[PDB]
Subunit: 450 residues, 3 copies
């Protein structure tokens, strides 16, 4: 049958000591709640009801494009109250899964098992075994079913030794949820309406609740502060690196690797220590990435080596190119096949054609550079002091001597040669040689201050 999710995300997250609400803090570059939304979506959820409250405006700006129903909870009166806000929208004969915006590691696989174990008119409850279950509600199994969740303070001596514990995530049909939610009270020490009580209420109705154990404890772990969040971060990154290693990516140290988005890869890819991969990154076969590199939203072709401490963003690099070390590719950098970019070089919004080299101490911006060019050390494309930023066009087989200033807008045609120390403001024609006539003063017998 159909499925919809409810995600609880209204918390202030006081112990984060932040102006952001609790669930907006990121894991692997994405808000915690966004992980849960994505998981709900790939689970097959028709509707996703987002219970929000604190930091309302920030939730809306940061998650403006998410396909969710925005259910604003004016008061935090408990998890049952929270879910009941969305209940008017539950279809009677759809399954409903309840998830927490601050527990982002929960997997689609675990949740499929939960949904599959839900008996008709009943509940599937996700549990977890802890080594020290102190403070948490114990699962009481009478036969194969859950008959009670006994809280720490109520449990007897032998019930305290039970390791199986309630996570609060559960699945039931929409009609059941509407019926049971209306029956939960707040007669307890905290004065709150607990979703937990649905288990007692189901048992009162002679309905079954089946437990499904989570495989990984970390899956159901929430974050109430930044220390806990950093532990979730490390577990997530290590799991991402492990999956890539098992797919054939050589990661020299998985504890020193960060993926903050998606990585598509060929075979025999090598990624050295302390690399960060952000946004959508695609690497072809036998790409090698040296230590300290940062790649954000790039496509890298087969057989390219990126040497240490290169930073690349929104760029494309063709096959057999060599980049780094200490290279910077800014947005719109498009490097063709067999190009060379070297140390202390910055390339911004420019195309560089096949075989061309830019190997030292150079800024190229808003330029088209053709094939088999040689851009010398210390070359700079610049503009006049004016308004907008104009383009430099360099054809094929051009030599640009070191320390040349190319003053946009300007064109240098095929086969041109420019001498070192030149200032180019006028168009250079095909096979034109431009050299600077320097005037120098030579003084003989000049003794330096020892």
């Amino acid at each position: 049958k159909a499925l919809s999710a409810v995600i609880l995300a209204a918390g202030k997250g006081t112990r984060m000591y932040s102006d952001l609400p609790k669930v907006l803090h990121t894991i692997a570059g994405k808000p915690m709640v966004k992980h849960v939304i994505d998981t709900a979506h790939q689970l097959g959820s028709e509707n996703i009801h987002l219970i929000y409250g604190h930091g309302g405006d920030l939730m809306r700006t940061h998650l403006a494009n998410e396909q969710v129903n925005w259910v604003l909870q004016t008061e935090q009166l408990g998890t049952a109250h929270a879910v009941q806000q969305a209940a008017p929208f539950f279809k009677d004969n759809e399954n409903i899964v309840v998830l927490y915006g601050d527990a982002p590691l929960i997997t689609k696989e675990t949740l499929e098992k939960l949904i599959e174990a839900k008996p008709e008119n009943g509940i599937a409850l996700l549990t977890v075994n802890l080594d020290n279950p102190t403070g948490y509600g114990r699962i009481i199994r009478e036969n194969g079913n859950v008959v009670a969740i006994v809280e720490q303070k109520d449990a007897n001596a032998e019930q305290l030794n039970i390791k199986e514990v309630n996570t609060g995530v559960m699945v039931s049909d929409g009609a059941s949820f509407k019926k049971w939610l209306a029956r939960v009270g707040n007669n307890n020490a905290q004065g709150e309406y607990y979703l937990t009580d649905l288990i007692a209420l189901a048992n009162q109705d002679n309905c079954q609740v089946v437990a499904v154990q989570a495989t990984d404890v970390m899956e159901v772990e929430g974050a109430n502060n930044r220390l806990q969040l950093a532990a979730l971060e490390r577990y997530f990154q290590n799991k991402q690196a492990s999956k890539l290693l098992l797919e054939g990516v050589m990661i020299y140290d998985p504890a020193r690797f960060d993926l903050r988005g998606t990585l598509e890869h060929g075979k025999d890819v090598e990624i050295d220590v302390n690399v960060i991969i952000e946004g959508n990154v695609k690497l072809g076969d036998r790409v090698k990435i040296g230590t300290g590199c940062v790649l954000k939203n790039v496509v890298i072709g087969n057989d390219v080596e990126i040497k240490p401490y290169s930073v690349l963003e929104d760029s494309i690099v063709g096959e057999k190119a060599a980049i780094g070390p200490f290279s910077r590719l800014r947005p719109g950098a498009e490097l063709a096949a067999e190009t060379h970019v070297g140390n202390f070089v910055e390339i911004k919004k420019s195309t560089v054609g096949k075989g061309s080299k830019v190997n030292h101490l150079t800024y190229v911006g808003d330029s088209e550079i053709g094939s088999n060019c040689n851009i010398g050390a210390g070359v700079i494309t610049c503009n006049y002091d004016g308004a907008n930023k104009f383009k430099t066009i360099i054809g094929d087989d051009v030599f640009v001597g070191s320390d040349t200033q190319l003053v946009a807008p300007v064109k240098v045609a095929n086969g041109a040669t420019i001498g070192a120390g030149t200032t180019i403001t006028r168009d250079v024609g095909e096979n034109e040689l431009v050299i600077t006539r320097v005037a120098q003063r030579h003084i003989q017998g000049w003794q330096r201050p020892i």
Copy 2:
């Protein structure tokens, strides 16, 4: 009552294989013994008696400014002999705490508990529970008190199973110390005067010794070699990162973060992987620090982003500034609000005014730069071949074209404009435009070597 400390710090530290004495090796940028001195001071110690010996001159030069009594021990005849060197200076009615210069992680909190548990005319002894207590003296409790410390070789079968062990740190009043120290002998396999024997001597006098367990084993851990020291280092750094995360600093990976000094922070600060913080550093609200950055003795204002692989020392950065990546701020760099410093830029002992930008391949040194200036790529402030290093003064709203050499001493007044490839040796007046007249030779039909 009053308190003074004794710190044992005379050891050669042979297994460090160093020209330094044992306690001078650093943890988090500070000598091990300096940690212990600081802890003693914040505990409220009136006097700190530093027992030193090996590497005497180095101890004095490296710790010249420490408020301690320098007690030179000519021979290392045991811990009791060491403490007795300082005993002539103990006030009869002050408490005395004994600490070890090579066990730097001991906390003020643990030591306050120790002092508080000391019975009158007695001793409080700090103990620790080990899982494998082999080699260490076992604590024998008769009722609530310690009646013996039984060494490995003397213990019977059941005493070997005792996990509680002697750390050697203790507190007693000064008169007791003077009396008992004079009674310790050296009749043992090692021929040494052990401070350990004070426990037996106290029990002989019908005086109480109360045990206080250390909460963390690592607290009382010493370092006899650099492997052990590296473990202390990692435990200290992880504990520092944990405290910051709990205060609301987002540290992406606490295992890849190093603090070597003090950090003051606002809210919503983000610190990426592999950052090093040294000396005294202050970060305002929502400062973001990219991967690989090194910050030593800097003040960073609200809302600044420091992009990857930036190194900053002895510098100030105003609010909403953007630094990096690959930027270098050397001592005396003062950047106003809303400034921009970019890749492969070095700024040394210079002020840069509000809104000004220095975005590529530039050295600025000994300069004052005003507000809303545009310093082009490849700009260099330099000096004549002479003696001292003179100043470059640039006013407000100045444009300095790329690859311009500013030759100090020189002034460029408000609103001036300098063209690319210029050499500035003479003062530039207000609203003055300076452009270089290049002479170029153009040769048509120059065929390049294919």
Copy 3:
């Protein structure tokens, strides 16, 4: 007696998802099989028989210089079949040790113990204790000897609780190997000839097999995929760092240190976090290496500091030199004593004499620079657009002003002085001063676009 080894290295390594065969994947920069070959050699092996098959051509190109007998196995019919390929070459009265090319961490020390425990006409079998020995063959000891290796599916209830397990590495004399190998069959579920069966066959012959336990479990660990290989990598690096720390090298974080070759060191060497050491590296006394540095095939003299994010390859640095941060030394960089190389500087195949400084934004290539020179910011050695790359020679006590282009081939004699913004194409004589005569246009009353 004499010894020879057999190394099994024919596997395809399917779960690596690589075009390389299994044993060519690297640990610490060296193929797994190369580790095992080296260990065999230092064990004293006269012959090393390398059983190879898959990726045959790649094995030959990558290991062309290894002193091994190349034994090509056309079909993988089991470990006994593999070893029997080399058996015609076993000397009757030499010991033979069998090792696996995909288990590279096995030590010479463990293997010496194995060889020493081998009884005459018998076998020494290397075993290991696992906490979960499921799937592995259990060692059955009758008295002091091994009488059977019982596989998972054959073991009874109490045999399943045995933790001691078969590793497959063993030692026997050559005649025994020839005799027993010819008797192993393939009547089992997998239809393979197992080397394991030698233990049964020895017991049939009334020959002794003695077990030798491995001290470290990781020693005998193989890698079937890149996740397992990364774990071997981390264990190896941590063990290398631990050995160096125990020798007196201060490594701030051994979990953030990589050695990929050999390191020779003096005393009081300090290596900060995230350093990579490759090839053969030699560091003198009190060398300090800042964070992020990469050193490949370099010799560093006493008392040099290398500041953060410096990359050095195939270079020599004399004593008291200061390098970095952000410095690049390319192959053939030879820096004398007391030199200074600064940020965003690249030095390639050049000698730089004592006291000379190159501190910013500079490329020096194919040059000889004398002693006490001052190479200014923005200096570049370049060539004409021609064929090969010519040399720049700079004598002693030369001042080269900032942004000077040195156009090879060219010589600058002792004591010369070159002004900023100069283009040098002609030889400069001793004590010659060369300054550029600029022509500038000054326009007063030029108002900038606000």
